Amino acid sequence: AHVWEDNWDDDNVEDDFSNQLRAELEKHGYKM
Amino acid sequence: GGRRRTDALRFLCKMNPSQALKVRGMVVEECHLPGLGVALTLDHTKNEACEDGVSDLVCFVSGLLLGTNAKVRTWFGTFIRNGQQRKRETSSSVLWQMRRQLLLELMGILPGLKEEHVVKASALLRLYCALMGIAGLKPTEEEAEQLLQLMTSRPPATPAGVRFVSLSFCMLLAFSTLVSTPEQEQLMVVWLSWMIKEEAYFESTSGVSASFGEMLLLVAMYFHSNQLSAIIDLVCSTLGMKIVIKPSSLSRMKTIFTQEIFTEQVVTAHAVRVPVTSNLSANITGFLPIHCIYQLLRSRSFTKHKVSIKDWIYRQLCETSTPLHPQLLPLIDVYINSILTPASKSNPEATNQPVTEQEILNIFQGQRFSITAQLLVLYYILSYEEALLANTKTLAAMQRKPKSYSSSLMDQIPIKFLIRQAQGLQQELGGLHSALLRLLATNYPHLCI
Amino acid sequence: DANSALMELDKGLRSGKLGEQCEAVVRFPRLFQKYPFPILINSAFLKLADVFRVGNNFLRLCVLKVTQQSEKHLEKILNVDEFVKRIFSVIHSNDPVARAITLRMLGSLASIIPERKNAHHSIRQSLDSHDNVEVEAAVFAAANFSAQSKDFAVGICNKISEMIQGLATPVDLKLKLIPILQHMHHDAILASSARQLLQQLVTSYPSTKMVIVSLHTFTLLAASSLVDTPKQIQLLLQYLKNDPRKAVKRLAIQDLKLLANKTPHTWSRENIQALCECALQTPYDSLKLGMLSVLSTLSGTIAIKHYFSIVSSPRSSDLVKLAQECCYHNNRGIAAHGVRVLTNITVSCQEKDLLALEQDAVFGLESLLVLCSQDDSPGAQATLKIALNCMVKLAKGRPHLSQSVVETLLTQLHSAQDAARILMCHCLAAIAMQLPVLGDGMLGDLMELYKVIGRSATDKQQELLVSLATVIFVASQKALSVESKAVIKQQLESVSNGWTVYRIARQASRMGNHDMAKELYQSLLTQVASEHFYFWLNSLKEFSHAEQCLTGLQEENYSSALSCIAESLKFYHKGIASLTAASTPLNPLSFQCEFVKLRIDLLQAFSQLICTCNSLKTSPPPAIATTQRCGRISNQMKQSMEEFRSLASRYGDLYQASFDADSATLRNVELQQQSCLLISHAIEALILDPESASFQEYGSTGTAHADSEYERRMMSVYNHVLEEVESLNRKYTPVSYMHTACLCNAIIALLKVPLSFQRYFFQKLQSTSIKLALSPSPRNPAEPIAVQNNQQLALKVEGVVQHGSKPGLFRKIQSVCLNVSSTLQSKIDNMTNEMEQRVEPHNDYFSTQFLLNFAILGTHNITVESSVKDANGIVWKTGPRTTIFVKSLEDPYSQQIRLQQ
Amino acid sequence: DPSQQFLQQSLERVYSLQHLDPQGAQELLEFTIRDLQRLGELQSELAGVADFSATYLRCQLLLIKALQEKLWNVAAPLYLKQSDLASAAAKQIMEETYKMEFMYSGVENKQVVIIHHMRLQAKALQLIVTARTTRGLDPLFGMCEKFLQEVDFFQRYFIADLPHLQDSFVDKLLDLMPRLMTSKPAEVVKILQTMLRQSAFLHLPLPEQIHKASATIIEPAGESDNPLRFTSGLVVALDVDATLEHVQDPQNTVKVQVLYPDGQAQMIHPKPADFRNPGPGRHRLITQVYLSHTAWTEACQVEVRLLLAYNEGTIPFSKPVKVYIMPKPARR
Structure with missing residues (x-):
């Protein structure tokens, strides 16, 4: 029931390394 | 012939600037001539002007010391020992000029600390910890002074900043030989006194659940309860490498925490004043206020120093979720032991009062709360009812009977429904389903039909 | 610390309290999961057995729960007879609840005891008893034994026939006992007797309840016994047509759904005619959705090709017109099913007088799209999923419609909400990925759409920017303009999450736009709050920098080739230093380091090759001595053979050792290895023995x-280099300068097409590991196992597989190749006992018996290697590489005998 | 019988429905393989014919799956050695052709000619994959010469039955036969690729009475936990009794194989005297197996399996059994 089979960005396809990366990276929320 | 080979390949590296990284590559992947690779890395650092990020030297030594492979770690380590045993004053050695390059980037990283230069210095502290850790490279007086300059700096507001100050705390606690003069001891006293009165701001703004304040409280409790192995485990976990540390330097550090600064009363008050970790779970790592308050519950100091616990435990139970942390079950156990067993014969009245009736009722009316919280509160109620029937020889001589939870509230608790829910989700609620079935079997043959 | 948990929990088991025993019993499944080896499993199951034997009937239910949960560990029990005897010693008790629990335990244990006769006797005896809990447990255990045993199946066939049509045992019990007939497929005449009994039951008890239960039983019998499934499909068509009840029709729908999913090749033409005709004259809409859902699942398989088979005009066929009026229906789900059917007819068989439906098909999609864009409900979201999957499949099957397809999609990309921009960007991403010629035809239009997102909402915003910039990277098949980089950059400076920019950066690194990857990696580098994540982002930055240096090339210019290659190597080496610093014990990044290292080695093979091509212009023809190979250049290109062939072997080794990547990452590794083979063949066809080539590429090149797109440009480069090699075969002198120019142009052509960091470089979906607990005595560390040097060493290697998540997502383990070898550590070296064995796991277990012959005098080094064999057949070289130490002692009598002799 | 009609309808659906996309042909073949195994397991009177058809369609399935492979999408130097799936498929279909012509009891010349033709297609697949692998001109030329004389042997021994079998691989192979004599071997192997692509799928007339040969070793059962104990360098005799059903000439064909847990194997020939004939269709093998080794440190699992031999090859037809063996040194 997925349109794009080679989608890198689904609901939950994020491995552990990317999980702590997202955890420490979404918190700041600013970019220069 | 080692020095002639380094001279020849160094002249070749100067001759062809591009493939110096290749000569480094062969040095790595055949583990031959480490000083040659370090010297050519220093030369290529001299060649570039790309010092906007971290140094290539820092990354290279971090890769060799703290790496997946072990034989390159042993090879670079014995290179460090061979550079250490060259006691006589000779500047031709590669290792000492690498120390001067690290000293130069120490000069550049110094201020407090800047926002863009916050993770550079943390990586540098990890590198120097590896150099005095697995590698074992004893520093000079000026290097140690500038280490104390760097670690006693002010991180601005960042989660990288709280990572820096935690690494600085373990940097101090790992090597107390690094401080030697009284002036640096006054400097670290001033730094610790700053690190006390600042924790709430970094905790609120950073948003991390793994700040430095619970680590401060942990080391206070571990020195107060004289548990040095817990300190060793904490610093080895936070630094990221296993280093063996002698207990004598930690005994001097134990004296400077127990005599001044962290007295037991202010430790208890500050540990009361910590916030709760919302959406606790077990997927978050760290060392946490829950382990802080569990350690302060094990070594009885709350009611010995007239501070409450009650709303903290209530809120932390109410802010728990899916897979459960492996600390809440002993936390509730020692909470019940604090409710029942008094602290000392000087005050037999001294105990913690249990959770009030209305709050438990508002939990079990709902769903506004989480099912993990509901199961945890059910465990608290059942274990309190069981243990209140157990430690009754001390209860009668205590004269402040906390009493059972009536029968109107106990009627308005679905026990079988939450036990079925615990059985249904037993895979992530590990350690609670077994306890609930134990309490149900030993206290409620109502429902074991 | 393996059995210590067993002694702890069994110390819990020897309490006199029910609660502590129950706690230990329910704590057993975690201990089962932690160590799965059959010594612990067998011991703990025997302890569970003799706790089950004496108990207060509530411990028994807990042990029943543990046996129900830990079903996959039941085949690992060694002492089966004692276990089953201890369990079976409770049937002869007089508490009916205890008896019912023990029959339920027998039903759970059914897999390990299929042909135990006393169990069957107990089931038959308790089955016609009068206590209701005993009866229900007996029906459960009869269902579980009847799925495996055959004599039990026939005897219980007679018994359950009697008790169903015995006119006692009221209707609830009959409903409970019909699934006994469901599990009754073992023998032909048994199945026929069950079929007759089910037909008699369904014509004898014409209720709502019994008809539903009997029909589900009857279709499970049909889908188990594949001898007359068309007869049941036929009977289902009369039940769906000629029956006024509604729930019976709904079971007919779900029944035909299951049968079409299972065995679609048995669906005959008149069956599809009957299903379509019954789908026409129905007055209801849920029933319409159900039948056309069944036809939609039937349309995805080879049933359509049987339906549209030669020996009537297919325009007049029922299915296509039914698809038309249900594609133009008011309800969204029936429209989605109808457009699936029409798309599936279009993608399938290519008869001429169907082509007009193609036009109808494409219009249907956009019509459905403009119905389901502006709704924002999960049903409409599922309709979006179904419609966009149909769009992808329709554009895939018929490419000449595809261009019209994509332009219609862009129209509904102008006016839809923030949940519809996503998944339409995904459909565009897929279509512009495999078929690229249309992607540029969007270009700038997405720009202005992206501008609108400057002032959109916030909740679904980040994923939507991710989708739009991903389809931007996919559509930019050639390059990106500087103004495009500027507008993307200024928009995500305007608002971004910080993780959104990381996703955009890794999408750009995937596609090949490494300059925006550089800039966003700079942005990440200033950011971020940990050590190894910082080092990881620095490494990715350096890789992007080297790849921009590789994009800065010019054809027929070797000076720029050497310069930009040197820049690429130095930036890759800063990056590989950062990667080595970023490696952690918890996450040991191994694919990334090896991929980057072999990329560095490929570019240095290219650098040595290009300067070796320069050597003919930098040295003599040979020497004054030489006047059929002359000169140092021959030896240098022989070294080029050695380096490139070794590099191809190392690419193959990286391919074989992963097993956890997707198809795209593996195909990229194949592209790099094929580049290495390409350069090796190109050199050994031009300069080193032209004589024995004689091939001229006698295989297909199209x-x-x-x-x-990266695959296509790689293949175009490969074909061009092989064309240059065939043309320049045996005309010119063996050294030549057209040969060196051919190598130069080949290296430039390979380095022009940039790179593609694939999915396995960033995220890992499947994680599979093997344990291989060696047990000759397992030793400790440096302590070796003593052998007596007159007998072999029974190694007894045993293993278990650990799956990270979703067991097998891409590939499935079929068999596992254990290899063992020895090595004389005293200083061939004991190659005499290289051994190989194939294992087929039952659930997760590996059990083999290895005998190792230690004969000479010394300390030997046993190494054990694993090798997974998949379903297709490719061997994969993973494994822990376990090593163990043995010392070889001698018998003093044998020593004195050897001294005397 | 419903089973007979179902088998005929399934076989006719396989034979007629051959004008498909290779994805659809693969799907139909896989579905009919699973259908035929399920039918053979359910039935016992028609188990042999269902298994025979399943083996034939398995050969056709692997042939078609090897035909569509990425190996014939890139050039010969760009070969992935490890990613090849069409290399081993020739060996499996070769072993399966042995399985048809020596497992199955009641066969006549039509089944023989069809499975011989499938063996010729198998050897063509092996020839083309070896031609894609190597680059030595002399080996490829030699293997081309052996393949052409194999085709010569096929048309010589089967000089008949060509009118009955139409539009096959070998028929229009012999149509272009003199040009196959005079061509470069690369031209020969490319025309063999083109030849296998429209090589038609033959129809197999099933024999009226067929039965599949198999063995059940009734003793030792292998579930006995006690070890067979003896002394190092000496021999132990374990009695094997097995039941053979539907085996033609067991004396020259059936053998026993012992796999030691060290890797080395033993191929024991039985005695014609020890073969019984307990009726027309079932036989009873009772022999003694002789085992010896050089002492072990614990009692290990020795493998015993009955093998069916043929003339130059051996293929398995019995369920494995395992025995515990304990060789000890002398007491002194």
């Missing part, structure tokens, strides 16, 4: 799948 009609490729072309699953990515």
Whole structure:
């Protein structure tokens, strides 16, 4: 029931390394 | 012939600037001539002007010391020992000029600390910890002074900043030989006194659940309860490498925490004043206020120093979720032991009062709360009812009977429904389903039909 | 610390309290999961057995729960007879609840005891008893034994026939006992007797309840016994047509759904005619959705090709017109099913007088799209999923419609909400990925759409920017303009999450736009709050920098080739230093380091090759001595053979050792290895022995799948280099300068097409590991196992597989190849006992018996290697590489005998 | 019988429905393989014919799956050695052709000619994959010469039955036969690729009475936990009794194989005297197996399996059994 089979960005396809990366990276929320 | 080979390949590296990284590559992947690779890395650092990020030297030594492979770690380590045993004053050695390059980037990283230069210095502290850790490279007086300059700096507001100050705390606690003069001891006293009165701001703004304040409280409790192995485990976990540390330097550090600064009363008050970790779970790592308050519950100091616990435990139970942390079950156990067993014969009245009736009722009316919280509160109620029937020889001589939870509230608790829910989700609620079935079997043959 | 948990929990088991025993019993499944080896499993199951034997009937239910949960560990029990005897010693008790629990335990244990006769006797005896809990447990255990045993199946066939049509045992019990007939497929005449009994039951008890239960039983019998499934499909068509009840029709729908999913090749033409005709004259809409859902699942398989088979005009066929009026229906789900059917007819068989439906098909999609864009409900979201999947499949099957397809999609990309921009960007991403010629035809239009997102909402915003910039990277098949970089950059400076920019950066690194990857990696580098994540982002930055240096090339210019290659190597080496610093014990990044290292080695093979091509212009023809190879250049290109062939072998080794990547990452590794083989063949065809080539590429050089644009450009480069090699075969002198120019142009052509960091470089979906607990005595560390040097060493290697998540997502383990070898550590070296064995796991277990012959005098080094064999057949070289130490002692009598002799 | 009609309808659906996309042909073949195994397991009177058809369609399935491979999408130097799936498929279909012509009891010349033709297609697949692998001109030329004389042997021994079998691989192979004599071997192997692509799928007339040969070793059962104990360098005799059903000439064909847990194997020939004939269709093998080794440190699992031999090859037809063996040194 997925349109794009080679989608890198689904609901939950994020491995552990990317999980702590997202955890420490979404918190700041600013970019220069 | 080692020095002639380094001279020849160094002249070749100067001759062809591009493939110096290749000569480094062969040095790595055949583990031959480490000083040659370090010297050519220093030369290529001299060649570039790309010092906007971290140094290539820092990354290279971090890769060799703290790496997946072990034989390159042993090879670079014995290179460090061979550079250490060259006691006589000779500047031709590669290792000492690498120390001067690290000293130069120490000069550049110094201020407090800047926002863009916050993770550079943390990586540098990890590198120097590896150099005095697995590698074992004893520093000079000026290097140690500038280490104390760097670690006693002010991180601005960042989660990288709280990572820096935690690494600085373990940097101090790992090597107390690094401080030697009284002036640096006054400097670290001033730094610790700053690190006390600042924790709430970094905790609120950073948003991390793994700040430095619970680590401060942990080391206070571990020195107060004289548990040095817990300190060793904490610093080895936070630094990221296993280093063996002698207990004598930690005994001097134990004296400077127990005599001044962290007295037991202010430790208890500050540990009361910590916030709760919302959406606790077990997927978050760290060392946490829950382990802080569990350690302060094990070594009885709350009611010995007239501070409450009650709303903290209530809120932390109410802010728990899916897979459960492996600390809440002993936390509730020692909470019940604090409710029942008094602290000392000087005050037999001294105990913690249990959770009030209305709050438990508002939990079990709902769903506004989480099912993990509901199961945890059910465990608290059942274990309190069981243990209140157990430690009754001390209860009668205590004269402040906390009493059972009536029968109107106990009627308005679905026990079988939450036990079925615990059985249904037993895979992530590990350690609670077994306890609930134990309490149900030993206290409620109502429902074991 | 393996059995210590067993003694702890069994110390819990020897309490006199029910609660502590129950706690230990329910704590057993975690201990089962932690160590799965059959010594612990057998011991703990025997302890569970003799706790079950004496108990207060509530411990028994807990042990029943543990046996129900830990079903996959039941085949690991060694002492089966004692276990089953201890369990079976409770049937002869007089508490009916205890008896019912023990029959339920027998039903759970059914897999390990299929042909135990006393169990069957107990089930038959308790089955016609009068206590209701005993009866229900007996029906459960009869269902579980009847799925495996055959004599039990026939005897219980007679018994359950009697008790169903015995006119006692009221209707609830009959409903409970019909699934006994469901599990009754073992023998032909048994199945026929069950079929007759089910037909008699369904015509004898014409209720709502019994008809539903009997029909589900009857279709499970049909889907188990594949001898007359068409007869049941036929009977289902009369039940769906000629029956006024509604729930019976709904079971007919779900029944035909299951049968079409299972065995679609048995669906005959008149069956599809009957299903379509019954789908026409129905007055209801849920029933319409159900039948056309069944026809939609039937349309995805080879049933359509049987339906549209030669020996009537297919325009007049029922299915296509039914698809038309249900594609133009008011309800969204029936429209989605109808457009699936029409798309599936279009993608399938190519008869001429169907082509007009193609036009109808494409219009249907956009019509459905403009119905389901502006709704924002999960049903409408599922309709979006179904419609966009149909759009992808329709554009895939018929490419000449595809261009019209994509332009219609862009129209509904102008006016829809923030949940519809996503998944339409995904459909565009897929279509512009495999078929690229349309992607540029969007270009700038997405720009202005992206501008609108400057002032959109916030909740679904980040994913939507991710989708739009991903389809931007996919559509930019050639390059990106500087103004495009500027507008993307200024928009995500305007608002971004910080993780959104990381996703955009890794999408750009995937596609090949490494300059925006550089800039966003700079942005990440200033950011971020940990050590190894910082080092990881620095490494990715350096890789992007080297790849921009590789994009800065010019054809027929070797000076710029050497310069930009040197820049690429120095930036890759800063990056590989950062990667080595970023490696952690918890996450040991191994694919990334090896991929980057072999990329560095490939570019240095290219650098040595290009300067070796320069050596003919930098040295003599040979020497004054030489006047059929003359000169140092021959030895240098022989070294080029050695380096490139070793590099191809190392690419193959990286391919074989992963097993956890996707198709795209593996195909990219194949592209790099094929580049190495290309350069090796090109050199050994021009300079080193032209004489024995004689091939001129006698294989196919066209009609490729072309699953990515990078694949297509790689294949075009490969074909061009092989064309240059065939043309310049045996005309010129063996050294030549057209040969060196051919190598130069080949290296430039390979380095022009940039790179593609694939999915396995960033995220890992499947994680599979093997344990291989060696047990000769397992030793400790440096302590070796003593052998007596007159007998072999029974190694007894045993293993278990650990799956990270979703067991097998891409590939499935079929068999596992254990290899063992020895090595004389005293200083061939004991190659005499290289051994190989194939294992087929039952659930997760590996059990083999290895005998190792230690004969000479010394300390030997046993190494054990694993090798997974998949379903297709490719061997994969993973494994822990376990090593163990043995010392070889001698018998003093044998020593004195050897001294005397 | 419903089973007979179902088998005929399934076989006719396989034979007629051959004008498909290779994805659809693969799907139909896989579905009919699973259908035929399920039918053979359910039935016992028609188990042999269902298994025979399943083996034939398995050969056709692997042939078609090897035909569509990425190996014939890139050039010969760009070969992935490890990613090849069409290399081993020739060996499996070769072993399966042995399985048809020596497992199955009641066969006549039509089944023989069809499975011989499938063996010729198998050897063509092996020839083309070896031609794609190597680059030595002399080996490829030699293997081309052996393949052409194999085709010569096929048309010589089967000089008949060509009118009955139409539009096959070998028929229009012999149509272009003199040009196959005079061509470069690369031209020969490319025309063999083109030849296998429209090589038609033959129809197999099933024999009226067929039965599949198999063995059940009734003793030792292998579930006995006690070890067979003896002394190092000496021999132990374990009695094997097995039941053979539907085996033609067991004396020259059936053998026993012992796999030691060290890797080395033993191929024991039985005695014609020890073969019984307990009726027309079932036989009873009772022999003694002789085992010896050089002492072990614990009692290990020795493998015993009955093998069916043929003339130059051996293929398995019995369920494995395992025995515990304990060789000890002398007491002194």
